[PDB]
C-alpha cells in the first residue's frame, strides 16, 4: 500500500544489453503511471493496452518491467509483431501483448566518446524466439554443416555482436534506452493499485 | 543448405562489423583534416591499417562462394563487389613497390619548384605560386616560361616513375582478369543483370565516341570565337587558322577555361551577375550561407538536413590556433554521421559550392539504407552530378531574386543570357575535349598499342587534333607532360568528370520536364515543387544496388549517355556563336610552327 520503484527502474544508471535484458518484477503498488505519462520527454510512448487513465484507475494483479538498450531505428521493432535484425532474436513481444513501451534517447549518458562497447546484441541465431524468453547462450553459430568445435572460423560465427555507441552519431544510431511494462490480470486478487 | 544461405549469413556478419570499423577509421581521418597535428596524424595510421586488414581478411574468405548458384540478384551484386582484392593480386613485394611509387607520385606533386630565369630567387611551386602567374599575368613570355619550366621539371622528375607505374598497374589488373588497368577503370561502368540493361565493359568507348562528335560543333564554334579575341590580344603569336598556343590558355593545363573569362568576355559593358556586396552589406556569415542551401533542398522536397550536421560540421574557419586543410569536402562517416568540411568566406562562389557540397551530402544521406556494399552512387559518375544540377539550378536570376539577394527588378534581357551562357560554357564545353583526350590517351597507353618510347608524340598529336591546342615548343620524349595534371599521377578515374557533364544536363531536362517548365532550359529553377524532387529521389536512394542503366532510366527515360539536352541548354549561345562566326573559320589546321625561321 505504497508507491513502488518505477523511478528506481527508470533512473538507474546501469541498463543491461538487449539480449541479457534484466527484469524487475514489481508487486503491491499504489501505482501512479501518470507522473510517468506526463513526462513528454520520452521518444516513444506507444501503448498497446488501455489508456493511461484506466491504467491509473484500475488495480492489476502483478506487473513486470523490462529494460534494455538498442539503436535508434529499432524502437519500432519492439512492438506486437515486427520482424527485423533483432526483433525476434533478442526481445520478441507476443501477438496480444498488453503493456507499454517507453523509450528515450539518452545519447550523452550511455555513449562515451571512443565507444561504449559494453552493449551487446545477438545477431543471427538458429530459430525465431518466443514471447519473453531471453537467450543468454553463447554457443557458436554453425552456418553450414562443417564442424568447427567451438572456435569462430570459416562459416562459424559468434552470435553476440556489439554496436559500439558514440556521441557523434545519427538520431537513429544512438542508444535509445527502452523499458517495457507487461501487465496481466489473473484470478488472484489484484495487488498493484492506483 | 545451398551456398545462398551461407552467402547471406556471411554478408550479415561482414556488414555488422565493417560498419563500425569504417566509422572509426573515417572519424580518425576526419579529426585529422580538421585539427592537423602530429597526434591526429599518427592516429590516422592504426585505424586505417585496421580497416585495410579487415578488408583483406574478409575478402579472402568470400571466394569459396563460386558465383554459379547465386539466383537472387542483390546478393550476386554484393559478392561481385566484395570479390575484388584491390591490388592484393600481386606478391607482397610488388604491392610494396606499387604503394611506394604511388606515394612518390603524390609527394612529388606536392613538392616541385621552378625559379624564374631572369629572377633566380623568386622560385615558386605549382600551387599558389604558379597558378596565379598562369591565370592573370597576361605577358606572353612570362606564362610561356612558367608553363615550360613546370612541365620540364615534372617531366624529368616523373617520366621513369609513370613509366614503371604503368607496367606495375598493368600486371596488377592482369592478375585480376582484366586486359589492362584501363579495363580496370572501365569495369566501373560494367553494370548488368536484367533484360537489356546489360551494359558491357567495352561499349563505353563506343558511347564516348558517339557522344563526343555530337558536341564537337559547339566546341569548334567556341574555339574559333575565343581565338578571334585572343588573337586581338596578341596579334603576333596567335594563328589566324591554326590552333592557339598552349601556355596562353585559361588554367595551368587547359582543363578548365574559366580563367580566360575577361580576355574573351562578350561585350564588356553589361553587369555580370554577382551578389558578393549584396549579402556583404546585409551581414551574412557562413551559417547563413548554409541556411539558404538547406532551405533550397527542403523546398524541393528532399530530406531536411540533420541536427548532428550543424554541430559537428566545420562551416567556417574556426577562431584560430588550428591548421586545417581548407578544401570543401562532404564527409559521410557512416552510422548517420554527416559532416561538411570547408572554409567559408562570404561570396557568390562560396554560395554555390554550398549547394554543391550539400548536394553531395543529400545524396549520401538518401542511400543510408542499403547493406553497406550498395553505398556508392549508381556508378562513379552520378555522384558529382547530383550535387551539380543543384548548383546550376541555383545560379539562375530567378532563384537569387526569390530570396531577394539582388534588386527585385532585374529584367533578364538577351545580353544577360548570352554573357551568362558563355560564362558557363567556358567551363562545361571547355573541360570535355581535354577530359576525353586525356582519358583516350591513358586508355591507349595502358593497352601498349603505342610504344613506351612513343608517349608524348601521339600525346600532343591527339591534343591538337581533338582539343585544338598546339604545344609552345616541340618537346622530345625526355618529358611526360600529362602526368603533370594532378588527377593523373594520383590514380583517380578521370572519365568521371566527363560523363557527369552530359548526365547533369540530361538530369536537368528530366526534372524540368516533370517540374512543368516552359522556357529555355538554362533559365529554369526546381524549387517550390514536389514531383521534381521525388522523381529524383526514386533513383537517389538506390546506390549501385541496381545496374546504373536502370537507375538512370528511372529519371530520364533514356538508357545511355544521350547528349541531346546539353546542346539544347547551350542553344542561345550556339546561335549567337554562329552569328559571331559568320566571317571566321570554324575549324583549324596543324601547320603553326613554334619557330621555323
Ligand atoms: C532515483 O534513483 C535513486 C536510487 O536508485 C532512488 O532512491 C530515487 O527514488 C530515484 N528517483 C525518484 C524520483 O524516485
Ligand atoms: C585539436 O588537437 C589537439 C591536439 O592535437 C587536442 O588537444 C584538441 O582537443 C583538438 N581539438 C578538437 C576540437 O578536437
Ligand atoms: C516559393 O514559394 C514561397 C511561398 O509559397 C515564396 O515565398 C517564394 O518566393 C517561392 N520561390 C520560388 C523560387 O518559387
Amino acid at each position: 500500500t505504497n508507491l513502488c520503484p518505477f523511478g528506481e527502474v527508470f533512473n538507474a544508471t546501469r541498463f543491461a544489453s538487449v539480449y541479457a535484458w534484466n527484469r524487475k518484477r514489481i508487486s503491491n503498488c499504489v501505482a501512479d503511471y501518470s507522473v510517468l505519462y506526463n513526462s513528454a520527454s520520452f521518444s516513444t510512448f506507444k501503448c498497446y493496452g488501455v489508456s493511461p487513465t484506466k491504467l491509473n484507475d484500475l488495480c492489476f494483479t502483478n506487473v513486470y518491467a523490462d529494460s534494455f538498450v538498442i539503436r535508434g531505428d529499432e524502437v519500432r521493432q519492439i512492438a506486437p509483431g515486427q520482424t527485423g535484425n533483432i526483433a525476434d532474436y533478442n526481445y520478441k513481444l507476443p501477438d496480444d501483448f498488453t503493456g507499454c513501451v517507453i523509450a528515450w534517447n539518452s545519447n550523452n549518458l550511455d555513449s562515451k566518446v571512443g565507444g561504449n562497447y559494453n552493449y551487446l546484441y545477438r545477431l543471427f541465431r538458429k530459430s525465431n524466439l518466443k514471447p519473453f524468453e531471453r537467450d543468454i547462450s553463447t554457443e557458436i553459430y554453425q552456418a553450414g554443416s562443417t564442424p568447427c568445435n567451438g572456435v569462430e572460423g570459416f562459416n562459424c560465427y559468434f552470435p553476440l555482436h556489439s554496436y559500439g555507441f558514440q556521441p557523434t552519431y545519427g538520431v537513429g544510431y544512438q542508444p535509445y534506452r527502452v523499458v517495457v511494462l507487461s501487465f496481466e490480470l489473473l484470478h488472484a486478487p489484484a495487488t498493484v493499485c492506483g | 543448405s545451398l551456398t545462398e544461405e551461407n552467402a547471406k549469413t556471411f554478408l550479415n556478419n561482414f556488414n555488422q562489423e565493417a560498419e563500425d570499423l569504417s566509422y572509426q577509421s573515417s572519424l580518425a581521418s576526419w579529426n585529422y583534416n580538421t585539427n592537423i597535428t602530429e597526434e591526429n596524424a599518427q592516429k590516422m595510421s592504426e585505424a586505417a591499417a585496421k580497416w585495410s586488414a579487415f578488408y583483406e581478411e574478409q575478402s579472402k574468405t568470400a571466394q569459396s562462394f563460386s558465383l554459379q548458384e547465386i539466383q537472387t540478384p542483390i546478393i550476386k551484386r554484393q559478392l561481385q563487389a566484395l570479390q575484388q582484392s584491390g591490388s592484393s593480386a600481386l606478391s607482397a613485394d610488388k604491392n610494396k613497390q606499387l604503394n611506394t611509387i604511388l606515394n612518390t607520385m603524390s609527394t612529388i606533386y606536392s613538392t616541385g619548384k621552378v625559379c624564374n630565369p631572369k629572377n633566380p630567387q623568386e622560385c615558386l611551386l605549382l600551387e599558389p605560386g604558379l597558378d596565379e602567374i598562369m591565370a592573370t599575368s597576361t605577358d606572353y613570355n612570362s606564362r610561356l616560361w612558367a608553363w615550360e619550366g613546370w612541365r620540364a621539371e615534372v617531366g624529368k622528375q616523373l617520366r621513369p616513375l609513370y613509366e614503371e607505374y604503368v607496367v606495375l598497374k598493368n600486371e596488377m589488373a592482369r592478375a585480376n582478369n582484366y586486359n589492362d588497368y584501363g579495363d580496370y577503370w572501365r569495369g566501373d561502368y560494367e553494370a548488368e543483370g536484367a533484360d537489356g540493361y546489360n551494359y558491357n565493359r567495352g561499349q563505353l568507348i563506343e558511347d564516348v565516341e558517339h557522344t563526343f562528335a555530337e558536341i564537337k560543333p559547339l566546341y569548334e564554334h567556341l574555339h574559333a570565337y575565343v581565338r578571334r579575341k585572343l588573337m586581338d590580344t596578341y596579334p603576333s603569336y596567335i594563328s589566324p587558322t591554326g590552333c592557339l598556343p598552349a601556355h596562353l590558355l585559361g588554367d595551368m593545363w587547359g582543363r578548365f577555361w574559366t580563367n580566360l573569362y575577361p580576355l574573351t568576355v562578350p561585350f564588356a559593358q553589361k553587369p555580370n551577375i554577382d551578389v558578393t556586396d549584396a549579402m556583404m552589406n546585409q551581414g551574412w556569415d557562413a551559417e547563413r550561407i548554409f541556411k539558404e542551401a538547406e532551405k533550397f533542398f527542403v523546398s524541393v522536397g528532399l530530406p531536411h538536413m540533420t541536427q548532428g550536421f550543424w554541430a559537428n560540421s566545420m562551416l567556417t574557419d574556426e577562431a584560430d590556433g588550428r591548421k586545417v586543410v581548407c578544401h570543401p569536402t562532404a564527409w559521410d562517416l557512416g552510422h548517420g554521421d554527416f559532416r561538411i568540411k570547408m572554409c567559408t568566406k562570404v561570396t557568390m562562389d562560396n554560395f554555390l559550392t554550398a549547394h554543391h557540397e550539400m548536394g553531395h551530402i543529400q545524396y549520401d544521406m538518401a542511400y543510408a539504407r542499403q547493406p553497406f556494399l550498395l553505398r556508392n552512387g549508381a556508378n562513379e559518375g552520378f555522384h558529382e552530378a547530383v550535387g551539380e544540377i543543384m548548383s546550376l539550378s541555383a545560379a539562375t536570376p530567378k532563384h537569387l531574386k526569390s530570396i531577394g539577394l539582388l534588386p527585385s527588378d532585374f529584367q533578364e534581357d538577351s545580353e544577360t543570357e548570352i554573357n551568362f551562357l558563355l560564362k558557363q560554357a567556358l567551363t562545361i564545353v571547355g573541360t570535355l575535349p581535354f577530359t576525353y583526350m586525356l582519358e583516350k590517351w591513358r586508355w591507349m597507353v595502358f593497352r601498349g598499342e603505342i610504344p613506351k618510347e612513343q608517349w608524348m608524340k601521339k600525346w600532343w598529336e591527339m591534343k591538337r587534333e581533338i582539343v585544338g591546342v598546339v604545344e609552345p615548343l616541340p618537346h622530345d620524349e625526355t618529358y611526360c607532360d600529362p602526368a603533370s595534371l594532378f588527377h593523373v599521377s594520383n590514380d583517380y578515374s578521370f572519365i568521371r568528370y566527363y560523363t557527369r557533364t552530359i548526365y547533369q544536363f540530361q538530369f536537368q531536362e528530366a526534372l524540368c520536364q516533370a517540374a512543368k517548365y516552359n522556357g529555355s532550359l538554362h533559365k529554369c529553377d526546381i524549387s517550390n515543387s514536389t514531383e521534381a524532387g521525388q522523381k529524383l529521389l526514386k533513383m537517389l536512394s538506390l546506390g549501385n544496388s541496381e545496374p546504373w542503366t536502370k537507375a538512370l532510366e528511372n529519371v530520364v527515360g533514356a538508357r545511355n549517355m544521350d547528349v541531346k539536352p546539353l546542346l539544347n541548354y547551350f542553344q542561345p549561345l550556339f546561335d549567337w556563336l554562329k552569328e559571331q562566326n559568320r566571317n571566321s573559320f570554324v575549324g583549324w589546321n596543324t601547320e603553326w610552327s613554334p619557330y621555323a625561321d
Side-chain angles (χ1 to χ4, degrees):
Chain A
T1 67
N2 222 338
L3 302 88
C4 67
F6 272 132
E8 321 192 313
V9 184
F10 285 81
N11 83 341
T13 50
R14 223 193 294 99
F15 270 166
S17 296
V18 54
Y19 84 86
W21 49 286
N22 298 111
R23 171 195 298 253
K24 180 186 204 314
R25 179 207 188 86
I26 318 298
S27 299
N28 304 276
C29 304
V30 191
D32 175 275
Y33 322 113
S34 180
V35 297
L36 192 168
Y37 153 73
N38 63 3
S39 178
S41 63
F42 298 129
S43 175
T44 304
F45 197 67
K46 293 166 185 70
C47 178
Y48 305 102
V50 303
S51 183
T53 68
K54 184 176 182 290
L55 304 171
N56 191 359
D57 272 328
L58 176 147
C59 166
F60 306 83
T61 58
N62 44 10
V63 301
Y64 290 70
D66 320 290
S67 44
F68 54 110
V69 187
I70 45 176
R71 325 210 321 287
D73 42 353
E74 295 175 10
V75 191
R76 82 171 77 87
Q77 284 195 357
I78 286 85
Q82 206 82 240
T83 73
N85 192 9
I86 53 166
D88 65 353
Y89 297 179
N90 296 24
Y91 189 67
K92 167 96 159 61
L93 279 157
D95 64 288
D96 76 316
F97 161 66
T98 82
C100 42
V101 191
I102 319 302
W104 66 81
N105 167 349
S106 204
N107 168 34
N108 56 357
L109 178 41
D110 266 345
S111 177
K112 75 182 166 64
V113 66
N116 185 8
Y117 281 146
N118 285 28
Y119 295 82
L120 310 165
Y121 77 122
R122 161 197 304 287
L123 197 58
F124 38 68
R125 189 173 159 270
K126 298 180 292 276
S127 176
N128 306 150
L129 283 151
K130 291 189 71 176
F132 288 145
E133 191 43 49
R134 171 199 301 96
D135 187 26
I136 324 153
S137 156
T138 62
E139 305 204 30
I140 302 274
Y141 185 76
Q142 203 169 8
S145 311
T146 171
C148 45
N149 274 287
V151 56
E152 74 267 51
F154 209 107
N155 294 321
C156 285
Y157 304 124
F158 198 115
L160 306 200
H161 274 141
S162 72
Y163 36 62
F165 293 111
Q166 289 215 7
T168 173
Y169 269 0
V171 191
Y173 281 53
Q174 283 172 7
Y176 280 60
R177 291 183 155 190
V178 194
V179 157
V180 178
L181 302 200
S182 174
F183 313 89
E184 187 70 356
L185 197 170
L186 277 74
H187 46 54
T191 75
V192 48
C193 317
Chain B
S1 279
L2 71 162
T3 311
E4 199 268 6
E5 270 68 6
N6 316 307
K8 210 256 182 165
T9 294
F10 177 56
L11 290 193
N12 273 321
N13 188 3
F14 174 68
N15 294 175
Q16 301 304 112
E17 280 322 317
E19 280 186 351
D20 294 309
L21 276 174
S22 89
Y23 187 113
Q24 200 59 42
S25 297
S26 159
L27 187 136
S29 175
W30 155 269
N31 272 321
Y32 175 62
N33 290 260
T34 309
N35 189 351
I36 289 188
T37 77
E38 66 184 3
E39 186 179 12
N40 315 76
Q42 182 274 348
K43 198 187 287 183
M44 266 189 61
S45 296
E46 71 178 21
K50 180 62 46 174
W51 171 245
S52 77
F54 181 91
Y55 211 81
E56 306 270 15
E57 183 49 285
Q58 215 70 42
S59 45
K60 293 286 182 65
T61 60
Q63 282 182 327
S64 168
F65 311 75
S66 45
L67 302 85
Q68 303 297 317
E69 306 78 356
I70 308 294
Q71 64 274 18
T72 59
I74 284 175
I75 292 89
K76 186 169 184 174
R77 189 92 33 74
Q78 289 223 47
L79 273 297
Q80 187 84 330
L82 183 56
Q83 285 191 358
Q84 281 65 18
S85 68
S87 66
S88 298
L90 319 167
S91 83
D93 57 83
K94 293 191 181 303
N95 183 20
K96 184 64 65 67
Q97 294 183 359
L98 188 141
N99 260 318
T100 316
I101 294 184
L102 186 143
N103 202 52
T104 74
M105 304 297 208
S106 186
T107 187
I108 200 57
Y109 164 80
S110 279
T111 176
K113 305 260 202 153
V114 284
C115 323
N116 308 280
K118 311 311 154 283
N119 184 327
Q121 311 331 318
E122 174 72 344
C123 199
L124 288 152
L125 71 166
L126 172 70
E127 214 54 26
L130 270 152
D131 66 346
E132 205 58 48
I133 296 192
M134 291 176 49
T136 75
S137 174
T138 305
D139 261 357
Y140 180 93
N141 267 305
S142 47
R143 280 183 53 184
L144 159 70
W145 182 85
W147 173 96
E148 177 270 299
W150 170 247
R151 305 304 186 211
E153 293 287 284
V154 305
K156 321 161 80 74
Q157 185 61 256
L158 277 183
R159 159 142 297 273
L161 262 185
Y162 212 84
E163 173 186 15
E164 173 55 10
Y165 160 76
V166 69
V167 191
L168 214 51
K169 265 299 189 163
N170 219 15
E171 267 166 308
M172 199 283 288
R174 178 158 291 266
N176 195 6
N177 187 285
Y178 276 128
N179 198 325
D180 70 339
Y181 199 64
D183 193 15
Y184 194 90
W185 275 330
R186 257 162 299 169
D188 199 338
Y189 300 90
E190 196 175 35
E192 56 195 359
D195 51 308
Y197 297 81
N198 265 263
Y199 191 101
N200 195 18
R201 204 174 78 260
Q203 191 165 341
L204 185 53
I205 299 92
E206 290 146 40
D207 259 333
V208 164
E209 298 294 342
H210 275 169
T211 187
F212 184 49
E214 198 143 10
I215 210 165
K216 194 65 155 302
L218 178 55
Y219 171 81
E220 299 150 301
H221 275 158
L222 185 139
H223 166 255
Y225 164 88
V226 159
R227 186 172 50 181
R228 286 299 95 191
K229 293 194 229 310
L230 260 55
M231 190 175 183
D232 184 286
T233 289
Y234 289 166
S236 45
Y237 303 123
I238 320 291
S239 178
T241 61
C243 322
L244 55 94
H247 68 268
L248 192 39
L249 264 172
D251 209 308
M252 252 306 309
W253 319 275
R255 170 178 161 260
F256 270 54
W257 268 8
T258 313
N259 265 278
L260 281 177
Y261 184 66
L263 272 176
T264 175
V265 58
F267 34 85
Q269 58 87 14
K270 268 296 185 169
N272 196 356
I273 183 55
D274 193 323
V275 295
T276 314
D277 63 335
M279 53 191 187
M280 267 295 321
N281 68 69
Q282 281 192 27
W284 283 357
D285 41 353
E287 185 178 2
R288 182 57 207 276
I289 284 175
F290 277 11
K291 259 286 189 187
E292 265 301 343
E294 182 182 3
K295 187 49 63 190
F296 159 57
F297 282 168
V298 77
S299 51
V300 58
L302 272 195
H304 194 274
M305 188 60 64
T306 185
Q307 171 186 351
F309 168 99
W310 288 123
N312 302 323
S313 157
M314 208 195 183
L315 318 161
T316 172
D317 178 29
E318 68 283 52
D320 276 329
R322 295 187 281 173
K323 308 190 307 294
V324 195
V325 168
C326 289
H327 179 293
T329 58
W331 279 126
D332 177 36
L333 315 186
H335 280 277
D337 187 302
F338 302 115
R339 294 187 200 144
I340 290 290
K341 183 180 68 65
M342 58 184 298
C343 276
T344 299
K345 282 85 183 183
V346 181
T347 309
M348 181 87 174
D349 292 331
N350 296 322
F351 169 82
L352 296 199
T353 315
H355 289 40
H356 173 37
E357 286 299 308
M358 263 183 85
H360 265 286
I361 289 302
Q362 205 58 258
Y363 194 44
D364 279 286
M365 182 186 175
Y367 64 83
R369 194 49 51 82
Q370 316 309 281
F372 174 67
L373 284 185
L374 320 176
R375 283 188 193 171
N376 284 49
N379 65 349
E380 67 178 1
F382 283 33
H383 220 290
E384 192 70 27
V386 166
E388 203 71 78
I389 80 167
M390 308 314 176
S391 195
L392 291 185
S393 168
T396 171
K398 185 158 48 177
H399 185 56
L400 317 186
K401 171 175 64 66
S402 159
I403 64 177
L405 162 73
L406 84 165
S408 51
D409 305 312
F410 208 84
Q411 303 84 339
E412 279 86 319
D413 56 67
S414 177
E415 301 282 66
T416 48
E417 284 188 353
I418 287 182
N419 217 334
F420 164 67
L421 289 201
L422 189 142
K423 182 216 175 189
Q424 284 192 349
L426 267 296
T427 197
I428 305 186
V429 174
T431 177
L432 297 198
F434 186 70
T435 286
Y436 158 69
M437 189 274 293
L438 170 63
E439 210 68 18
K440 182 196 163 71
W441 181 90
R442 284 201 304 195
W443 292 354
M444 285 168 49
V445 71
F446 283 167
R447 287 193 222 85
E449 48 195 356
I450 60 176
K452 60 142 189 194
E453 203 266 352
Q454 277 300 88
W455 274 359
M456 298 306 105
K457 171 70 157 43
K458 208 162 202 184
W459 151 247
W460 279 116
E461 279 169 306
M462 317 171 77
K463 178 113 166 185
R464 61 165 56 162
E465 306 324 318
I466 199 62
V467 196
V469 180
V470 302
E471 44 180 294
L473 296 101
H475 282 172
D476 292 297
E477 296 302 320
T478 55
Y479 304 110
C480 168
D481 282 28
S484 54
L485 173 48
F486 156 67
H487 267 66
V488 168
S489 42
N490 296 277
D491 286 4
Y492 272 81
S493 65
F494 188 42
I495 208 63
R496 160 205 305 99
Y497 293 118
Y498 184 102
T499 72
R500 67 166 175 87
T501 296
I502 299 170
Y503 277 106
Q504 66 198 269
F505 300 114
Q506 215 159 339
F507 286 114
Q508 196 80 260
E509 180 179 0
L511 296 180
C512 316
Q513 156 176 295
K516 312 151 301 301
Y517 176 73
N518 311 334
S520 177
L521 196 67
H522 71 270
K523 186 168 41 65
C524 82
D525 63 335
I526 71 177
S527 44
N528 276 347
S529 86
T530 65
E531 177 72 13
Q534 155 76 29
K535 193 194 183 187
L536 177 52
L537 197 38
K538 183 171 203 60
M539 173 272 303
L540 210 74
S541 89
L542 281 182
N544 53 7
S545 176
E546 179 87 49
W548 59 256
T549 69
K550 177 73 173 177
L552 187 45
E553 194 268 358
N554 297 121
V555 67
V556 66
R559 224 176 303 275
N560 291 316
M561 303 190 303
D562 185 28
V563 55
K564 186 269 168 185
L566 185 152
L567 303 179
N568 165 57
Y569 188 100
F570 286 9
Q571 192 45 259
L573 180 55
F574 191 66
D575 309 315
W576 183 84
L577 274 185
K578 293 196 315 171
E579 293 179 0
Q580 304 287 334
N581 292 146
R582 301 178 141 175
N583 316 69
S584 43
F585 179 35
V586 172
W588 49 90
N589 316 334
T590 77
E591 279 300 330
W592 169 88
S593 162
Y595 209 73
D597 313 324

